[PDB]
Amino acid sequence: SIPPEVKFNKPFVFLMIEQNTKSPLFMGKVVNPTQK
C-alpha cells in the first residue's frame, strides 16, 4: 500500500514522557485491550 500501512493490531509497548524533564511519566504494554 501507498502510503504504507501501519496497523497496531497486535501487542505493543508504549510510553509517555514529559518534554521539559524528559521523565518517564507512565509506561505500558497492551496485550489485550478487552481485559480491563
Binding site: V6, F12, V31, N32, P33
Partner: protein, 339 residues
C-alpha cells in the same frame, strides 16, 4: 544547570528495569504503571532510613551513590516535582505527596520538615483505630487528586498501622493531530496466536512522526500532546517482541525525541482502557529492595518509639486513550507497622 536531567536517566533506567520484571511475570496480560509515582514515594521514604536499608532503596532505584551524592538526589527530586506541577495551559498534569500518621507517633521533626520542603508533602493526623474510617479518609485523597480516576487504592488496611505514605499523579492531554471520530471502526486485534478480539480502531492518513529502526526491529510513532508532553508507541516486528523490550534504553528514547521528521502513512490504532494494580513487594525484591520490607528495616529516621517496617507497597494506574487524547492516572500506597 538543572537537577532533573541529572536524575532523569536514573529514573528512566529504573523504569525499564522495573518493567522487565513485570514482563517476566505474565506474558499474557496488560501492563501499566507510573514509574514516577512509584519512584518518588520510595524516595521520600528513604528520607527516614538509615544504613543498609536506606542504601538498597536509593540504589535499587538505579542511583549510584559514589557518583552522585545523596543530598543532591532529593535536590533533584524537589525540582522535577516543581516543574511537573507547573501549569501547562493546554495540558493538565499534577502530583501529590501525603503522609498519614497516627495521633500517638512523635516524629523526628527533621524528617518531617524534610518531606515538607523537598517533596512538598502534606501532613495528616489520623486514628488507625478506626480502620474503616481511616481507610476512607485516604481513599478520598487519592480520589480527589486523581479526579475520580482511581478510587479503591487501599483495599485492606492493616489494623496496627502506624503510618502511611501516599502519592498520586494525574494526566489529561489532547493530541495535536486528533483523530476524527467518523473514522473509528471496529477491526481485529491479534492478541495471541489464537485469540482475536474486536476493537474500536481509530484511523487517519496523514503526516506522522513515524519511522522504523532495524535496531529495535520495530515501527515507532511519536504523538505530541498540545503542551510539554508526548506519546511514543513501539510496534514490534513479528516475533521480535521480547527483543524490543530488551533493547529499550533511555538514550535511544532521547534520540527519537530530538527527531521531528514527518513521513506519510495510514495509521490504525486502538482506543483503550486498561488498568494495572500491583503488589510491588516481590518485584522490588528482585530489584534488590528487601530490607525495608523485613525485620531488618531501619526507620529510626521517622520515629524513635518503635521499630517499624513496610508491610505493603501497592500501586495502581489507569489509562484511557481515544481520538481526542489521553487521560491517565496513578498512585502509590505504602503502609508501615511495628515488627
Amino acid at each position: 544547570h538543572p537537577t532533573f536531567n541529572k536524575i532523569t536517566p536514573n529514573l528512566a533506567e529504573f523504569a525499564f528495569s522495573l518493567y522487565r520484571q513485570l514482563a517476566h511475570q505474565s506474558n499474557s496480560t496488560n501492563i501499566f504503571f507510573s514509574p514516577v509515582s512509584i519512584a518518588t514515594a520510595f524516595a521520600m521514604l528513604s528520607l527516614g532510613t538509615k544504613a543498609d536499608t536506606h542504601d538498597e532503596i536509593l540504589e535499587g532505584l538505579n542511583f549510584n551513590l559514589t557518583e552522585i551524592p545523596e543530598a543532591q538526589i532529593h535536590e533533584g527530586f524537589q525540582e522535577l516535582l516543581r516543574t511537573l506541577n507547573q501549569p501547562d495551559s493546554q495540558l493538565q498534569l499534577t502530583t501529590g505527596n501525603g503522609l498519614f500518621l497516627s495521633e500517638g507517633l512523635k516524629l523526628v521533626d527533621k524528617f518531617l520538615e524534610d518531606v515538607k520542603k523537598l517533596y512538598h508533602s502534606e501532613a495528616f493526623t489520623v486514628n488507625f483505630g478506626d480502620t474503616e474510617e481511616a481507610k476512607k479518609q485516604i481513599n478520598d485523597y487519592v480520589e480527589k487528586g486523581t479526579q475520580g480516576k482511581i478510587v479503591d487504592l487501599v483495599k485492606e488496611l492493616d489494623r496496627d498501622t502506624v503510618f502511611a505514605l501516599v502519592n498520586y499523579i494525574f494526566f489529561k492531554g489532547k493530541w495535536e493531530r486528533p483523530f476524527e471520530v467518523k473514522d473509528t471502526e471496529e477491526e481485529d486485534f491479534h492478541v495471541d496466536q489464537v485469540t482475536t478480539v474486536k476493537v474500536p480502531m481509530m484511523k487517519r492518513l496523514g503526516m506522522f512522526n513515524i519511522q522504523h529502526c532495524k535496531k529495535l526491529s520495530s515501527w515507532v510513532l511519536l504523538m505530541k500532546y498540545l503542551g510539554n508532553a508526548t506519546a511514543i508507541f513501539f510496534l514490534p516486528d513479528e516475533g521480535k517482541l521480547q527483543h524490543l523490550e530488551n533493547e529499550l534504553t533511555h538514550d535511544i528514547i532521547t534520540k527519537f525525541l530530538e527527531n521531528e521528521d514527518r513521513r506519510s502513512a495510514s495509521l490504525h490504532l486502538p482506543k483503550l482502557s486498561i488498568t494495572g494494580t500491583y503488589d510491588l513487594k516481590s518485584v522490588l525484591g528482585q530489584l534488590g529492595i528487601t530490607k525495608v520490607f523485613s525485620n531488618g528495616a531501619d526507620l529510626s529516621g521517622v520515629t524513635e518509639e518503635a521499630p517499624l517496617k513496610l508491610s505493603k507497597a501497592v500501586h495502581k494506574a489507569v489509562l484511557t486513550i481515544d481520538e481526542k487524547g489521553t487521560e491517565a492516572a496513578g498512585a502509590m500506597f505504602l503502609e508501615a507497622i511495628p515488627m
